[PDB]
Nucleic acid binder design. Structure first.
Lengths: 65, 88, 77, 74, 67, 73, 62
RNA sequence: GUUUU
């Protein structure tokens, strides 16, 4: 229902389940709603990962940055 | 499936249901479905939610922990061989 | 196959671990693939921590049905 | 691949860790597609097998699938 | 009327959602589906004003609507 | 660029898997399935915020269930 | 089912252990409580609200 | 692909 294509190379604050925020560069994605984020920052609380994959079955919310 | 049968085998009976919340409730099993959701006429206190005015309740199946049953209400060879037959 | 190996012990005494430091010992009367269970002559013992001390409590029941979502381990005593 | 691994270690000794942090060391008897696990001669430790032994199971142990975090060999 | 159909025929109205985080979300609603996944627009969230926002149905406690 | 293609390319590399809890595994990625279950080789397992709980030797089926993040490297 | 409960006053006990008095206009097979004029059990909360089955522990007819 | 295993 959300067309993630409009977020290509964009910023988004993704809330995960277990209280884990993640701000990344939406590099790609699929239909189960898995993400591929870049310059990923994992707000636990600042923690830096690189290019990450986010399992879209624990994805709680998705806004922009 | 199996426990749907068995739970149906227990209608018109008085049982004690204990929920995950630690709330506890006595009553007459009026209805059973697949999710194991439970229905009871004659709500009573044996741990009890603060209700005095309610007759019949719908217990969300996913929230039951224990159902307490008398030895009599049940044929044990029935359940045993049934289980022996169940596929998985 | 682990559920068949479970079938092996019907009418045989069993030891089940549940979430919440809850232990049940009783005789295995029934079960399905959700690890839903009926047991007879079963005592439940609960481990509780209150006031910074551990204690154990108990609860006997002749026949008890058990929601499988809380089940952790099944073996024999 | 995961599908065949679970056929590849049958009879070996595995550590199975549950969501709780409890871990169980033992010989793999069998496993199904629902993550269910049958160990024989399983011991129970918290977090690590180097910690205090908490339980020995003489007979078979059934570990429920939903609760399984990992199945590890060594 | 089922709450879900009563959500599909709600597309365009304005609503408030409570996530099971303590967090509250006011916002008008642009799309819904069968798992109660929501795409809102004109949105504010608490414990922040946003163009769009997608929410997983299973992270909803309840949904307060209008009179 | 598809998530699974990413995870595919990290086969034979070092990967960091972050659970929806406070636990992390690092090790060589060997394989994955459609449910994103994960095979890991010689995983080190950590509790966070650290502590190194264990060094694994051999392969580990890590239940895709609780997986939240993967990080190539 | 709650197919007996349509339009009656109801008491809902949630898994977090709070009570609510309400009226159930509609419901689904996931016990998503479609209710109106909700309030604690003591100040009202809303007229017309949606509760998710996941948070229902228990529905009672009053 | 998401609430009742």
């Amino acid at each position: 229902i959300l067309d993630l294509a409009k977020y290509k190379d964009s910023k988004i604050r993704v809330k995960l389940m277990g209280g884990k925020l993640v701000i990344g560069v939406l590099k790609g994605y699929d239909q189960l709603m898995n993400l591929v984020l870049d310059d990923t920052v994992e707000y636990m609380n600042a923690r830096k990962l690189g290019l990450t994959v986010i399992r879209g079955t624990i994805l709680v919310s998705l806004s922009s940055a | 499936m199996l426990f749907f049968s068995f739970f149906k085998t227990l209608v018109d009976q008085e049982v004690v249901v204990e929920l995950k919340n630690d709330i506890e409730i006595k009553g007459t099993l009026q209805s059973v479905d697949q999710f194991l959701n439970l229905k009871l006429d004659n709500i009573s206190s044996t741990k009890y939610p603060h209700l005095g005015s309610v007759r019949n309740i719908f217990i969300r199946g996913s929230t039951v922990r224990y159902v307490y049953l008398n030895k009599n209400m049940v044929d044990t060879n029935l359940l045993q061989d049934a289980t022996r037959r169940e596929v998985m | 196959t682990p559920l068949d190996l479970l079938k092996l012990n019907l009418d045989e005494r069993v030891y089940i671990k549940l979430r919440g430091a809850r232990t049940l010992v009783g005789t295995l009367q029934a079960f399905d693939s959700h690890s839903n269970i009926v047991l007879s002559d079963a005592v439940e013992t609960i481990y509780q921590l209150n006031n910074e001390e551990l204690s154990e409590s108990e609860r006997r029941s002749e026949m008890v049905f058990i929601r499988g979502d809380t089940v952790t381990l099944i073996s024999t005593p | 691949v995961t599908t065949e691994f679970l056929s590849d270690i049958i009879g070996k000794t595995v550590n199975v860790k549950l969501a709780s942090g409890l871990l169980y060391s033992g010989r793999l008897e069998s496993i199904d597609g629902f993550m269910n696990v049958a160990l024989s001669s399983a011991t129970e430790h918290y977090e690590s097998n180097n910690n205090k032994l908490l339980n020995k199971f003489n007979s078979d142990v059934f570990l429920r699938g939903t609760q399984v975090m990992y199945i590890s060999e060594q | 009327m089922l709450p879900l159909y009563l959500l599909t025929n709600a597309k365009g109205q304005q609503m408030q959602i409570e996530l099971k985080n303590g967090e509250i979300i006011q916002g008008i609603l642009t799309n819904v589906d069968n798992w109660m996944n929501l795409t809102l627009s004109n949105v504010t969230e608490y414990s922040v004003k946003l163009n769009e926002i997608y929410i997983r149905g299973t992270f909803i406690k309840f949904i307060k609507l209008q009179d | 660029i598809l998530p699974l293609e990413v995870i595919d390319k990290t086969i034979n590399q070092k990967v960091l898997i972050v659970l929806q809890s406070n636990r992390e595994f690092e090790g060589t990625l060997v394989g994955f399935d459609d449910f994103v279950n994960v095979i890991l080789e010689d995983a080190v397992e950590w509790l966070i915020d650290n502590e190194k709980v264990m060094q694994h030797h051999g392969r580990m089926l890590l239940s895709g269930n609780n997986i939240a993040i993967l990080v190539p490297g | 089912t709650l197919k007996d409960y349509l339009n009656k006053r109801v008491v809902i006990i949630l898994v977090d252990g709070e009570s609510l008095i309400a009226s159930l206009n509609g419901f689904d097979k996931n016990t998503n409580l479609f209710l109106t004029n909700v309030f604690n059990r003591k100040e009202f909360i809303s007229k017309a609200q949606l509760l998710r089955g996941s948070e229902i522990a228990l529905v009672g007819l009053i």
